[model samples]
Target chain A: SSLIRRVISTAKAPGAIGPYSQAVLVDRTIYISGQIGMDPSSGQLVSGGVAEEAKQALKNMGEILKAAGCDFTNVVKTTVLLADINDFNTVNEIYKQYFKSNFPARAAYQVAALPKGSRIEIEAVAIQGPLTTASL
Target chain B: SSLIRRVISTAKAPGAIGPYSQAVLVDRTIYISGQIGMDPSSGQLVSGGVAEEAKQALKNMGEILKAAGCDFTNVVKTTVLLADINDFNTVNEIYKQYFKSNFPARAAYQVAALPKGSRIEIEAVAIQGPLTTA
Candidate 1:
């Protein structure tokens, strides 16, 4: 079947509140759905300002990627959506801690609002090895 | 070379009204240029209702996928833009008809407006299949 492969979900990452998957692995690529600041254990928005939220979101993504048999180094691109563009500097400061040196291609946008009134939402694509492959 | 791959254009889909390919097939993945519901055959707005427009837009997407040596089933993900949040139901109805079970993961949002005043636009990722080891 040529249909898109369904990615396995993990409790290590926040569960989807809407009708979408946490991430999907097809061929060598993993397309992670947008992650907010929700803490998987608490199932609530982690209360910490933009930086805290950003770190949590990245952590959530890392967990999901690990479940799919890859890691941060495999990430190739990311899309960041912020309810407030003013927090870009803080978000970037937190983001850099996860990704050092070779940063993935990224695009940041200011949206009118986000689900759960979250301050930030992040989505990414990762590949394994030098070619960036995702687990099936 | 990286530059060897070029952008593809199709009036069947909304013409790249912006700076992008109607679809770009890179590394065996087809990145469809966004599509709106303007009738490629007539170059006029596909008349009728939101559902009709959604159908036409998906059809345009189908054309691009076919041209790229794949089909709707090959789609891995899609990003949908709508001018009216109210039309989500209508669009979803039409969308399901194009995709069968185990549908590609998708995201939908309500945008302020779309180019050419169309009600919706769609972009997608479709895989032709695994790369040949040969």
Candidate 2:
């Protein structure tokens, strides 16, 4: 058998500004697009600086995950991009709230820039359930 | 049936400096770690500027793909990170040599820095075959 691919989209999350989909699910694996801190309704980066931006971005990511019928626990890997590495600890403080344990494999770094001039962008890869946790 | 995950390793590719595997295969999908230009033998980056670094990085990627019994064609997505965005075109020229068509979904941009102070780093996701091209 082969995997069936589907594009996952949700209005609860910000719409794509480019030609990319919000997420692509092939079989049970979902490849989520890099989410910035744009508010879905207002279509603007939420105020209150990087902390607010990080929370909003993660919230947007959560919406995409929910659209795909999974949540943060289903995430297997993630890449965190920041305009300034100084915000690493700030973002991580927020990131850990969503992923408390069995955290996904990750790569984090500061990038030259991000889409929409946003301070943070988070992309993820998640698998659908029913999952069997290997407690090893 | 559930997927079986295997950590792919080979002396042909430079070893990882962190807590990550060279590649992780779950079911038929493979997640490869970001690769730099370090030569596997000397454990140092090759000379000749960014072009040479890109070539070495792709070569290392090829070795990892081979270790998993696939090649560049099996790749579905890639992220190209550069120390300077100016070298994007130059890197793409070399990148196209290995991937001729059905180019993988890609995201490219400049990064503030990379491990080992390398100019370029590439990470990829691939699927194992026999694949049905669609």
Candidate 3:
């Protein structure tokens, strides 16, 4: 089937705990499964509040994007899930530090709970691009 | 920047309520913002039930796709949001009437609420194919 393809694997990012991928690249687009703040090296949740969790979660996405030969600039969209909307300010502050102007279109929502009691989860879509200053 | 381009607009679909377009065509793909069924002419809720809302929502999507020189068949994936999962059967019944076989890969979830108290909101990723079908 045209849909079947090799599953991309990486240890730089946390492994999937459920029936999903760290990220799946189909055609030219890379669909990143949601990432929580689980440290790949230790396979444990990162400590701290929304800011720390957000950074680690985005770090996981960054690794996958690198593995797929793309970067934050190539990301066209992201859906952010925060366990509580009150952390919006903190998450937004950290998120702004990552992607500058012309950020990808995004939507944020408060979910009942995140897998493994995570405080924040992020998923993104990016296209292939040059690995210049774009590398993050 | 590669992101800078002429913004496309269509009156057949709901006007963007925020800092986004009804759909943005980048490269060969069209990224449609989340769409909820709101009558374009009246700017009010459409009458009837969830099935009617689904039909109108798809109709709105069809118009935007047409504006971009594509159609339902070009859609590769879709995300559906429903206020009530019990209405899934009715929504699916109406949804099946829009696309042919080998339908787009989809993920559906029941959200707490859709904008304007609507029953459902849908977003899609469609490819710009041969304009002959548009």
Candidate with the greatest DockQ versus the true structure: 1
Off by over 4 Å in 1: A1-6, A14-20, A39-52, A130-136, B1-20, B47-50, B84-90, B130-134
Can you give the DockQ of every candidate in the order shown? 0.18, 0.15, 0.11
Q: Which candidate should be chosen as best, given TM-score against the real structure?
A: 1
Model 2 per-residue lDDT tens digits across residues B16-59? 55434677666677888788888999989999879999999999
Pairs that clash in candidate 3: none
lDDT winner, 1 or 3:
1
Chain B only, TM-score of each candidate: 0.86, 0.97, 0.90
Q: Which run of 10 residues does model 3 chain B get worst, by summed lDDT?
A: B1-10
**TM per candidate:** 0.77, 0.64, 0.67
Error of 2 at A109 (Å): 5.7
Per-residue C-alpha lDDT of model 1 across residues B38-131, encoded as one tens digit per residue: 7876776798867778888899999888777778877777877777767876887788788864456565656667877888888888777642
Question: RMSD to the native, candidate 2?
Answer: 5.3
TM-score, predicted candidate 3 vs. hidden true structure: 0.67
| Stretch of 10 with least lDDT, candidate 1 chain A | A1-10
**Which residue runs of candidate 2 sit more than 4 Å off their true CA positions?**
A1-21, A24-26, A39-44, A85-112, A131-136, B1-22, B38-77, B85-117, B130-134
**How much is B25 displaced in model 3, in angstroms?**
4.1
Task: Name the candidate, 1 or 2, with the larger DockQ value.
Answer: 1
